[PDB]
Design a protein around this ligand. Sequence first.
Ligand SMILES: Cn1ccc2c(S(=O)(=O)N(CC(F)(F)F)c3ccc4c(c3)CCCN4C(=O)c3cccs3)cccc21
Length: 218
Amino acid sequence: EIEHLVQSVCKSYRETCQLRLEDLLRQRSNIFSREEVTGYQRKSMWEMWERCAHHLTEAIQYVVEFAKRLSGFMELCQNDQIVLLKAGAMEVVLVRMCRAYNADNRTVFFEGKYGGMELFRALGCSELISSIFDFSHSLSALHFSEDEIALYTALVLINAHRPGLQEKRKVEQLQYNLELAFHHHLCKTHRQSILAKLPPKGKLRSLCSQHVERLQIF
Ligand SMILES: Cn1ccc2c(S(=O)(=O)N(CC(F)(F)F)c3ccc4c(c3)CCCN4C(=O)c3cccs3)cccc21
């Protein structure tokens, strides 16, 4: 039952989405004041990193939970579960971020209110911050439904081309079933148009790099 897989993926996302879409939307009117932005800008680069590291670690935890709830993920050997999540959990976090991005005014939900990219000045990777904002802006243009996000992010994670897989065929089978589910659903809703608009697999990989690794120090 591939319809069972669909329903399961969608439930797992609903249970682990971290922030409810209705709360994210309702809070769009809530914008960081100039004094609050200045307050963030005054923080040490080190403090901004530890705050961001904390929030990212928390977000990853929920992505791992999501994976553990996917029918068949738990059937994979432990080595492969680790390989897939090590490679893909942060990629899913970056995709999930688009829900918390408001294209109207180019702001992102951060610690309870919406702010623009200048809020993150203290991080000192303004090229990186700009790329994250641009990526989120690109995804927001797709107007993902919750279920499309569920199925798309499951496929970000369940990718049989990750180096180091011990049971590649098992992962291929799971990935293919999930692709069938996704493509079938998009076809029944006339949403085929989004596939061509998704970021190339290389874009997500490129963004998910040297900056977000070795955060143990934080
Ligand atoms: C605009 N925007 C919104 C949120 C936010 C935060 S955050 O702290 O709310 N946040 C944690 C989470 F969203 F998961 F909850 C977050 C987001 C991005 C990043 C990080 C954390 C770590 C820094 C870099 N960094 C990244 O490069 C990446 C992480 C994962 C893939 S790339 C930081 C920076 C820009 C942000």
